[PDB]
Design a protein around this ligand. Structure first.
Ligand SMILES: CCOC(=O)CC(C)=O
Ligand SMILES: *N[C@@H](CCO)C(=O)O
Lengths: 461, 465
């Protein structure tokens, strides 16, 4: 455990976290310093010093952060700007070879300067080019009236959370301090991160609805100004579709930037390029499938009226923080990304409609069955399906609980995996409260139908 | 988790314990060990298989055996060790996990959720190329300083998945070829589990490794007692005792038994023991690798052995390659500085062993330069070579030992022979032999002597009022 091994290196009672950038580390150090100034917060960089090759030097670095063991929402500050697992292993191998600097926490490495005895080459650049190309190909619009996204309209970050924060920070440091709006995007760290980006109190329309849009449009017409709006297609966990057409009309008429997350309802399934100025994506999820690598994307629509100002910011502030091992497995697993989306989307519809028709369930959240099924159709590509995520609303919550227990599949917080996985309310607790969310995997429709059926029987008396 | 992923495939997420094995044979050992302690317990054995693959190599390795058995069953020390040897690599299990979906099962007889779909690992040819490397490094480092001694070749080396495994393979060969087996030192506590499992009706444990014990052996032999094989290990864990190999080869010659020596702790880099062992076993997991990240075991058949033809033919005629290719790779890269690492760790160890031995709040240190058997270690030490990487510490009062271990800012755990320094007490590895009970053991790593002398020192201060 690189964390354990780095507390050993600094002779240690406190608690620690590890980050890739000097920047993100101190983003946490403030949160602790505000919750308790005069608390001894320590920020130690580890760096490999004598290394001819530029690969090891650039990547064999990290920031340990010690802070009083004496944990609010920093969950999304860490889950988001943390270090990769593949990265953190890469450092634990080399931790003896690298020195520290802050105190006595300036300890040099017992084996510093020694020549180590990685697979990837060139900072995984050729594989990142592959990743950018896939994202650019799949977001291409069915509209020939539009410019294509190119691979250099695509930006890659350590995680999806990080990609989100990076666009929030650009909007704020862009000229003109106007409000940020968050539309529906909930049950995630986006509102925390948007706050960490300088938008002190954004306007949250939490339900994603047209009523909420009305309130917004009244606001804007009254003379209220707004720099950016954040939204996410096929919202978690209810599979809602925001009205991306109306949002783009409001955006054109009142001058704000539209940022959509397409993680859940994929670019394979939906054509949203025409309504978004920027498109964020978590590559950790379905794009990868395997649950083994981490990565975030950020797509700047060359059609946006804000392309020049957004691209130039992101570019002038770009640092490559996608660890190359991650980048490699990602470029590998993302080739069947459209086929896995299509397969998973097909199974999901199946058992979504299966479960919809069982007398123990009140209704199922799936784009084919939710109030906004017609909104989803405005953006659904032909011959493409209805997504891999769904959620179950049972009639009696006792039943849901017995059902979840009896369900012999993977359980946990991940989505977009090649294996189906479920999560109850015990989690996703920072919309009924006995909801059971299902991310449908690459398994046969029968196998899944089997496991669901058996679990249904176990929960009935 | 591969265990966890398998329990789901077979619809048993609760109720039972489970182990993962290589052969249905091994699975039966457990099924036997559970059925003797408790017949009527439901023991279930599922086999998992990638049946066909466009790259056949994979489907050969993507196999394993899940053994489920009731959670009320507690393993005795025996099972714990037999399962270490009958288990599968961590690298091997992760391979299988990445493929479990594509794999079918058969007792639980379900086709896999991704069966038939196309799933490539880096390694090639089952990693045969890198296992010949390993085989050669092992043969090079074991060549004796004696000029008349034949050199060990690569096809005198056999590779297996763990040091445990190797030891069993030779135990099983000597059995079926007389059933008295001798264990002369405090072995890996898996050595006796293996020779009892290998059907030796008459074992003899000499736990202290002394000449008095060697006397009891010689009297028995003259007076007519049979003996087949004798198992030993130089620089014994953890008192770093050295056995009188000269006498053991002398008894072996006078009476015709076969001598296995385990050179894991006193290395082949430091010691020339080939003149005495008919067979030499090594845990390649330990310092041979050093990185704490791959599993392997070795078995060298001395070409100078009066029993060399018989032993080699058995091990050849009964051979199966079970060394997971990804492990073989890592070993064959890391074993390049194996001799130079042994030299650096043995250098830093001797340094802080003496530092400690001169400390007033400490009785004695266990290390070959400071133990009663030092004259023995010096008989087999090579010129220019040191006194090993392991050491243990007998403090004057057990109280001090406790608060020393706690305050010592370095790695802690059962691992030895790593590139890092690691401490562990007698608290662990007790699943009586003139071994004190508050002993503290230290595998010395590649860290600087100053750095490690620092951590030792600060800990000694925190241990005094
Ligand atoms: C801890 C919050 O859980 C989640 O929302 C995770 C998810 C993929 O949806
Ligand atoms: N998708 C999730 C991360 C899973 O733990 C989020 O941050 O919204």
């Amino acid at each position: 455990g690189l964390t354990e091994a780095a507390l050993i290196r600094v002779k240690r009672g406190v608690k620690a976290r590890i980050f890739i950038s000097r920047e993100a580390a101190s983003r946490l150090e403030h949160t602790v310093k505000v919750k308790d100034p005069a608390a001894k917060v320590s920020v130690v960089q580890f760096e490999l010093r004598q290394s001819n090759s530029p690969d090891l030097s650039n990547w064999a670095r990290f920031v340990l952060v010690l802070f009083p063991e004496s944990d609010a929402f920093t969950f999304w500050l860490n889950h988001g700007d943390g270090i990769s697992n593949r990265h953190a292993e890469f450092c634990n191998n080399l931790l003896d070879f690298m020195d520290s600097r802050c105190p006595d926490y300036q300890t040099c490495g017992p084996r510093s300067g020694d020549k180590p005895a990685p697979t990837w080459t060139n900072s995984g650049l050729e594989e990142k080019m592959v990743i950018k190309s896939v994202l650019a190909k799949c977001i291409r619009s069915e509209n020939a009236d539009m410019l294509p996204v190119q691979s250099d309209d695509v930006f890659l970050y350590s995680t999806g959370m990080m990609a989100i924060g990076k666009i929030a920070r650009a909007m704020k440091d862009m000229p003109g301090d106007d409000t940020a709006v968050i539309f529906g995007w909930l049950y995630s760290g986006t509102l925390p991160l948007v706050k960490d980006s300088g938008y002190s109190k954004p306007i949250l329309y939490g339900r994603g609805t047209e009523e909420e849009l009305d309130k917004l449009e009244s606001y804007l017409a009254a003379g209220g100004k707004c720099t950016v709006l954040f939204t996410e297609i096929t919202s978690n966990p209810q599979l809602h579709s925001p009205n991306l057409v109306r949002i783009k009309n409001l955006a054109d008429e009142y001058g704000f930037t539209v940022v959509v997350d397409d993680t859940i309802g994929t670019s394979v399934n939906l054509d949203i390029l025409p309504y978004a100025d920027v498109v964020t994506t978590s590559l950790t999820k379905i794009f990868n499938g395997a649950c083994n690598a981490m990565g975030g994307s950020l797509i700047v629509n060359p059609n946006s009226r804000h392309y020049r100002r957004i691209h130039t910011y992101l570019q002038g502030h770009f640092e490559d923080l996608l660890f190359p091992a991650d980048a490699v497995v990602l470029s590998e697993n993302c080739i069947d990304y459209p086929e896995r989306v299509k397969r998973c989307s097909a199974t999901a519809r199946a058992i979504a409609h299966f479960l919809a028709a069982h007398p123990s369930i009140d209704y199922v959240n799936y784009p084919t069955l939710v109030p906004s099924r017609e909104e989803y159709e405005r953006y659904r590509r032909d011959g493409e399906g209805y997504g891999y995520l769904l959620s179950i609303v049972f009639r009696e919550p006792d039943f849901a609980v017995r059902f979840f227990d009896a369900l012999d599949i993977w359980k946990g917080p991940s989505i977009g995996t090649n294996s189906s996985i479920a999560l109850p309310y015990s989690v996703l607790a920072h919309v009924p409260k006995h909801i059971v969310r299902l991310s449908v995997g690459l398994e046969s429709e029968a196998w899944l139908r089997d496991r669901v059926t058996e679990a249904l029987a176990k929960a009935t008396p």
